[PDB]
Amino acid sequence: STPITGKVTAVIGAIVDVHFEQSELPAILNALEIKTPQGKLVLEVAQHLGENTVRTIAMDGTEGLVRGEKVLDTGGPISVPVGRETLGRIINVIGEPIDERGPIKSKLRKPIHADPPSFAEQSTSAEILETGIKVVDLLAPYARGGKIGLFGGAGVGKTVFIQELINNIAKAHGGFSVFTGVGERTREGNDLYREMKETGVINLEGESKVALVFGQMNEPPGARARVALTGLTIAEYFRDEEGQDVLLFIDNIFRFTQAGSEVSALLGRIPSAVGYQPTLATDMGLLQERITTTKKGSVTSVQAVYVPADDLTDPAPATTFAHLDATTVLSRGISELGIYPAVDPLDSKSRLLDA
Amino acid sequence: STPITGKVTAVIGAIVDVHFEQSELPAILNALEIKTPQGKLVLEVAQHLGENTVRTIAMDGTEGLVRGEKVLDTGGPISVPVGRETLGRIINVIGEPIDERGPIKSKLRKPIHADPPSF
Amino acid sequence: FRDEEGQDVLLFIDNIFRFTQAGSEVSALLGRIPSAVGYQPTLATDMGLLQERITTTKKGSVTSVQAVYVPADDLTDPAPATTFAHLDATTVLSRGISELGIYPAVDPLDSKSRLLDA
Amino acid sequence: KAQPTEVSSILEERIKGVSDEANLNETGRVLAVGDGIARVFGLNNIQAEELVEFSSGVKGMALNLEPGQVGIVLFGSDRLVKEGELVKRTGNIVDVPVGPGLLGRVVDALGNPIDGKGPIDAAGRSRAQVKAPGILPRRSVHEPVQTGLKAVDALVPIGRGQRELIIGDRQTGKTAVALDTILNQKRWNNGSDESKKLYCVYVAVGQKRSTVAQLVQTLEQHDAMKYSIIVAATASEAAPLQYLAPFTAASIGEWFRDNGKHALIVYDDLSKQAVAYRQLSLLLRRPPGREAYPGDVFYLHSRLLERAAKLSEKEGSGSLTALPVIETQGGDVSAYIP
Amino acid sequence: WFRDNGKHALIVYDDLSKQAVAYRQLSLLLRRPPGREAYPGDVFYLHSRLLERAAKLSEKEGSGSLTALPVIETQGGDVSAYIP
Amino acid sequence: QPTEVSSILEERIKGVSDEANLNETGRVLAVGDGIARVFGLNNIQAEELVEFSSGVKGMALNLEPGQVGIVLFGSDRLVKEGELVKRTGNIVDVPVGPGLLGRVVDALGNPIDGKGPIDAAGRSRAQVKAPGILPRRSVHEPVQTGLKAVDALVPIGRGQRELIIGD
Amino acid sequence: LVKRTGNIVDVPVGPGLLGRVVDALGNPIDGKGPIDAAGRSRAQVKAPGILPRRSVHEPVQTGLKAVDALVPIGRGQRELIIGD
Amino acid sequence: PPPVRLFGVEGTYATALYQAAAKNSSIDAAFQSLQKVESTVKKNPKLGHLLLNPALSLKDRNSVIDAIVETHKNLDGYVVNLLKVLSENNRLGCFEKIASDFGVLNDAHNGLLKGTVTSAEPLDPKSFKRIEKALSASKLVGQGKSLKLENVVKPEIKGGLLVELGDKTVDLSISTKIQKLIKVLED
Numbered sequence A: 001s002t003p004i005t006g007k008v009t010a011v012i013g014a015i016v017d018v019h020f021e022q023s024e025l026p027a028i029l030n031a032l033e034i035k036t037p038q039g040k041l042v043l044e045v046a047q048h049l050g051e052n053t054v055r056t057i058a059m060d061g062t063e064g065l066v067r068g069e070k071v072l073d074t075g076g077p078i079s080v081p082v083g084r085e086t087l088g089r090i091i092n093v094i095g096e097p098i099d100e101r102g103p104i105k106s107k108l109r110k111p112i113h114a115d116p117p118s119f120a121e122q123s124t125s126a127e128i129l130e131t132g133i134k135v136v137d138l139l140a141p142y143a144r145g146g147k148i149g150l151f152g153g154a155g156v157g158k159t160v161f162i163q164e165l166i167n168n169i170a171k172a173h174g175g176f177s178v179f180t181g182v183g184e185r186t187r188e189g190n191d192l193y194r195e196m197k198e199t200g201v202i203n204l205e206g207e208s209k210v211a212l213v214f215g216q217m218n219e220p221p222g223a224r225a226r227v228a229l230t231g232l233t234i235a236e237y238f239r240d241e242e243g244q245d246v247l248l249f250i251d252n253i254f255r256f257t258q259a260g261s262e263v264s265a266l267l268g269r270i271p272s273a274v275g276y277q278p279t280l281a282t283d284m285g286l287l288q289e290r291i292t293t294t295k296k297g298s299v300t301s302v303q304a305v306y307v308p309a310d311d312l313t314d315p316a317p318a319t320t321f322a323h324l325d326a327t328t329v330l331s332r333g334i335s336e337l338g339i340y341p342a343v344d345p346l347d348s349k350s351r352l353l354d355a
Numbered sequence B: 001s002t003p004i005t006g007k008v009t010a011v012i013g014a015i016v017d018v019h020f021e022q023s024e025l026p027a028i029l030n031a032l033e034i035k036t037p038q039g040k041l042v043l044e045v046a047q048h049l050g051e052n053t054v055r056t057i058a059m060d061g062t063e064g065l066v067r068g069e070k071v072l073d074t075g076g077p078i079s080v081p082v083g084r085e086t087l088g089r090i091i092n093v094i095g096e097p098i099d100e101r102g103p104i105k106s107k108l109r110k111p112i113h114a115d116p117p118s119f
Numbered sequence C: 001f002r003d004e005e006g007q008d009v010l011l012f013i014d015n016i017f018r019f020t021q022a023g024s025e026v027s028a029l030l031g032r033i034p035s036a037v038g039y040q041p042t043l044a045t046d047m048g049l050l051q052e053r054i055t056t057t058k059k060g061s062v063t064s065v066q067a068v069y070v071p072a073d074d075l076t077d078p079a080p081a082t083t084f085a086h087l088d089a090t091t092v093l094s095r096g097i098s099e100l101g102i103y104p105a106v107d108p109l110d111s112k113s114r115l116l117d118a
Numbered sequence D: 001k002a003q004p005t006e007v008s009s010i011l012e013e014r015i016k017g018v019s020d021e022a023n024l025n026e027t028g029r030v031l032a033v034g035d036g037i038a039r040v041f042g043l044n045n046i047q048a049e050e051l052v053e054f055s056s057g058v059k060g061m062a063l064n065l066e067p068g069q070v071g072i073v074l075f076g077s078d079r080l081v082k083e084g085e086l087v088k089r090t091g092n093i094v095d096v097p098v099g100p101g102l103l104g105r106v107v108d109a110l111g112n113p114i115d116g117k118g119p120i121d122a123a124g125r126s127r128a129q130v131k132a133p134g135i136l137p138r139r140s141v142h143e144p145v146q147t148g149l150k151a152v153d154a155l156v157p158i159g160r161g162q163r164e165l166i167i168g169d170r171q172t173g174k175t176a177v178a179l180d181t182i183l184n185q186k187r188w189n190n191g192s193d194e195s196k197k198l199y200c201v202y203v204a205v206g207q208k209r210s211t212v213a214q215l216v217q218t219l220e221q222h223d224a225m226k227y228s229i230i231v232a233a234t235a236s237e238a239a240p241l242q243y244l245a246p247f248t249a250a251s252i253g254e255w256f257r258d259n260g261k262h263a264l265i266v267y268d269d270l271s272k273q274a275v276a277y278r279q280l281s282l283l284l285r286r287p288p289g290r291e292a293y294p295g296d297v298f299y300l301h302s303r304l305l306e307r308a309a310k311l312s313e314k315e316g317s318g319s320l321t322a323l324p325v326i327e328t329q330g331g332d333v334s335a336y337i338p
Numbered sequence E: 001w002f003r004d005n006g007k008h009a010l011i012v013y014d015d016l017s018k019q020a021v022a023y024r025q026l027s028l029l030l031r032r033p034p035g036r037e038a039y040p041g042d043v044f045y046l047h048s049r050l051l052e053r054a055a056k057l058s059e060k061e062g063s064g065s066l067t068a069l070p071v072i073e074t075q076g077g078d079v080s081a082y083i084p
Numbered sequence F: 001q002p003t004e005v006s007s008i009l010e011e012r013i014k015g016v017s018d019e020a021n022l023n024e025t026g027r028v029l030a031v032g033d034g035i036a037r038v039f040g041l042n043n044i045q046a047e048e049l050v051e052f053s054s055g056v057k058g059m060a061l062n063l064e065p066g067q068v069g070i071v072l073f074g075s076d077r078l079v080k081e082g083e084l085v086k087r088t089g090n091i092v093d094v095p096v097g098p099g100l101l102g103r104v105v106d107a108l109g110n111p112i113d114g115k116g117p118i119d120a121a122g123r124s125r126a127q128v129k130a131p132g133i134l135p136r137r138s139v140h141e142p143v144q145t146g147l148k149a150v151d152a153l154v155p156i157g158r159g160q161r162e163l164i165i166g167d
Numbered sequence G: 001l002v003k004r005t006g007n008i009v010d011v012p013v014g015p016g017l018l019g020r021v022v023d024a025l026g027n028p029i030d031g032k033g034p035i036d037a038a039g040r041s042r043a044q045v046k047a048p049g050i051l052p053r054r055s056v057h058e059p060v061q062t063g064l065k066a067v068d069a070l071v072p073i074g075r076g077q078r079e080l081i082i083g084d
Numbered sequence H: 001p002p003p004v005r006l007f008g009v010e011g012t013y014a015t016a017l018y019q020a021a022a023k024n025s026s027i028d029a030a031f032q033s034l035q036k037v038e039s040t041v042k043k044n045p046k047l048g049h050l051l052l053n054p055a056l057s058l059k060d061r062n063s064v065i066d067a068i069v070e071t072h073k074n075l076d077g078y079v080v081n082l083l084k085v086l087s088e089n090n091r092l093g094c095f096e097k098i099a100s101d102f103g104v105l106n107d108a109h110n111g112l113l114k115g116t117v118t119s120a121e122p123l124d125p126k127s128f129k130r131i132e133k134a135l136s137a138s139k140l141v142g143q144g145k146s147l148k149l150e151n152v153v154k155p156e157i158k159g160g161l162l163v164e165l166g167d168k169t170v171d172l173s174i175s176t177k178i179q180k181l182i183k184v185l186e187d
């Protein structure tokens, strides 16, 4: 079959408009790969503008965008590598490894966006997860397959808590884990990868147990908005085909919803639902609903919620407060006293904390 | 009198756009009856968009409305039956008695948008 | 007066906020997309050239004395807030002291100047 | 003269049959798909808020009927619908199945089962949006129904047919009192007398599958799931699904109400219903009103909450009871929608 | 340039709110879709692209370091606004 | 209405139906408030430096099909509607090197201090991507700011992005 | 058909308006008869300049026996009356 | 300068075409081509629906253009260029309007000013001729131009006429006059 291709007509910042031919118009949430001199750039459709034109968001730096360049469709969403080979390698939202260690020869390749599990597949989790931390093992035990929330502000130690969780779980459990770095700092990213290398969870010359889905904030807002669902796709691929319990780690759900509202700001997306994003409910439920304890396996989603100066009035922290079942708030005041884990014994509740 | 008629062009929820002909455009606050299977629906005009089209507001639900549906112009504001026959009877905004007591046998129908008195 | 005459100019600009108000005035009908709280998008730039045209040069000096009408006594309003950063000496006439009896009303805290040096 | 005939003959092709064999009255071509919205030119015989098929699997409704394009709200994900797709009108206004088959089953805004236990055998199909009962065929709300919770039973008793509002903040236990009433109906729903029976229906507009699943699970643990009808338009589902689901449940309750039986509708989290309809209107070129909500959200809520009513003994004395909640923030019910 | 040459550099981003305001003016004049507090869309992306450049390079890259010191001006101490 | 009106607006206001080779050149349809709209420049890049006939530089941020949106590097007085515009063929850059030390420069690298010209070891792109994830090192060398409080309780290290947020 | 009157928007002005109630256009609405005006003045008239203006020195007797007296109004002041 | 001012995208193409024809001094050829195209559109009602279709693709719009162009073998050296410009701008749903403003431009310059002598009853042809000569000899927009007044039987007029000619109508209708005494009677 002839590759499906078109011409770029407009590029407004991170938003690129491409014109396609007759019967050549693709669907939304697809991949529009444009051969760029600075590597490879692919665009994802957000809405149809009519006149055989599609409004897209750049998944990679918009440097060098010229109207009329040949952009070829991939036949769907940009498939990311999924499989055991992805473990120990940082994978971005575009599937092109940023570790210069060779392409990930994954078993399969799944699109970022997929139908969430049906209502029957939904179930509750009532199994204890061994995290290796006394306070959170006793007072607020984790749920195997549930949605955990790691609240905390700035300088409280959320990301280090997440990486310690991955290390302890990998040491105490052979199930694979995935860490999506939505809104992840590059210096923090280098720290995370160095810690993963030094802790033995990531073995370059052997078998690893955690795959990074780092977001790399300096990429356009679409990458930050979709790294979360990329890591979620990795998690569900690990859960379904392998049939093992996996550990989904959201770097910052607040950054995910901020990036969603951001990409809404680039496009029309007239904010109506909460005020800053009208779609927020739709994609937020699409993401959260996809982490489900299906009959194949269980995915435990440990998301970190960043509250700026306790901005509970904003609907964004409350939306995350609605999803989770057990909280692990990391109030800074406790860390200022000397207990650097900073988890509040009285504010970190657990749903499954019962006799 | 000429048979003034229009064609539905847009249904903005409750708002309904109807396209008339030259000199057949009714004024605003003018009832525009449309024959519907669930009874009788009329629309009063509030804005004249232009190009022989007038924006109207429905007095009831616009269920089943189709573009090109014939719209009949009453000639003035929404005439409602008046007189002693309306006492003790439930009459809606349009004027059709909704008390399930039969039609109102009123000899007059004064328009709702009557001219207010002077200072 | 500063350049050609070489004299110390005592410029007394009265209600300089009206310049930004008129900029927003014309901006609404100029087709410009309104900025935050409805101000003109180009407020910062145009007031920047206007205020930077006032400076102490080698030829002379212009001692501009500007009074800024803060809308609703809200110092976070973009025009007075940016005028704060685009000005050396600040004298805030808070209403809370004006009605307190000290009608000079110079709030003794936000009224700051760069001359406060030992 | 021969050349005009030849060009008229050849004009039939090279035009993708947009005018020939289609007439653009029951079919059409989508100009562009947006955020749950597909603008399509044609459908000259389209009806107001009437269902339409996109020839892809997803449904749609022509809530807006602009002359240049028929604004259709997508009934599902907007991914599978593309610009230029051939659409076909269903010929009927948006309707959902109604009957006793939905008892002990799950449904959605379109009335289809989500858990997939089996096909729905509802005895009849009623329109999603029907006119409220008239002023005459109604009676004063007099049959009492016990709530279970003392704080509402002994202080603000909800009657059979009254549209009482249990309004609260983000975290106030509105769903808790709703489930309290649902489980308190078990005492009479396991009996024989239909007058004391109350087939309750609960809406899950915009609520994620996790919370709805936990609610269905804890409802099943009390063995009260049999006499309760559960409709769900989840957060993952599009905003039009969220907008329709309360109307679906309104039709479900009206089926029991017009059949002489007593039904309870609990319109859980109608605030996000209001925001979903606001999103649909703002995305449909509708003029914004107060708090950016369209002026017809009050129209929608009036139409929805007037369905639940106590009919006279002429209509079998069936009553539909409404218990919506409004998830206000900060206790400020002074806003426009509350 | 100093960072890639093995030298240590310190960059201070004074009045980043002014840059945000200038970008807002540019986007609003260009009829780009406005966002929160009328700010432009790709403003967080702008700030990230500007700030993530400054970092500490590895030994194989010369062991250079670029220290970023961004400065912003809050409106009445409100750190809950978009740019803050 | 047998013939409805559905058109909204089009950036083309002068029907020429001829003339070509406007890939590298263009004409300013509208200019004002420090921005300009130019039809043409088909082979121009995103925010690529573009030279006007009056000498004022520009940046191509908006690239809509009708025209390319150009923001002006100065006042709009010198640029008028219909003026010829030409591509510079390169993105905006800035002189960099050790000679920048001891000089005050403009945002474009022009020395505004007035103490002579500027000597730079080379020229680097203004919009340079951040360093990759792998070529990074943990921040361990401190930056001695001098003030006791910042040095002690909120220390700054080399390569660390520390925000000084204040009223 | 929309005929233009050929003149700027005007309103009757003069001593005959005393004792008469008129609309915005100046037409008699009280029904007491026609309005006798010395001339017609534009509804939109430029305000007097600095020199034509004079310092407010002539008092206006408010007759309120309140702060309206201790702090007066005077002839020519636009003294506001705010409140609910 | 074009003879009259046109506004909106439905009319900008018309004045652009008139300006182009002024350069070649072939206004008559473009006019005749436009009449032939709209006659062909009227000949096939389906073709008119084809033009008004906004969803019709670029290749399909081009094919419609080659259909309307192959007949008569060429409409004009420039109007085909305007048609293809409309195709690449997706403006085939307004060609009737563009022809309308081009015709208005044609009578604007060719001395064919149009008038609307509207009356309650159809105008008597003996009285019709009296109206033509007086206005033709008058100086109302008179610089050596012909006149094309046509009777407009409307119900809004109670009786009389409203002689309309170039932004000039006379309030000689007896309906407006009898009303004008009413408000002063209600003083």
Ligand SMILES: Nc1ncnc2c1ncn2[C@@H]1O[C@H](COP(=O)(O)OP(=O)(O)O)[C@@H](O)[C@H]1O
Pocket: A153, A154, A155, A156, A157, A158, A159, A160, A161, A188, A340, A341
């Ligand atoms: N339990 C801990 N043990 C040692 N150091 C910690 C611990 N928690 C936090 N830190 C330090 O505090 C810093 C917090 O960084 P990070 O967690 O990425 O940001 P935030 O605290 O805002 O989530 C880290 O650089 C880390 O060195």
Ligand SMILES: Nc1ncnc2c1ncn2[C@@H]1O[C@H](COP(=O)(O)OP(=O)(O)O)[C@@H](O)[C@H]1O
Pocket: D168, D169, D170, D171, D172, D173, D174, D175, D176, D177
């Ligand atoms: N009457 C009650 N008794 C005990 N717990 C309650 C009660 N009402 C609410 N809760 C608590 O509230 C939580 C659920 O709140 P929810 O009903 O979802 O609030 P909302 O109805 O505002 O969404 C439960 O965990 C439960 O412990």
Ligand SMILES: [Mg+2]
Pocket: A158, A159
């Ligand atoms: Mg962190």
Ligand SMILES: [Mg+2]
Pocket: D174, D175
């Ligand atoms: Mg609830």
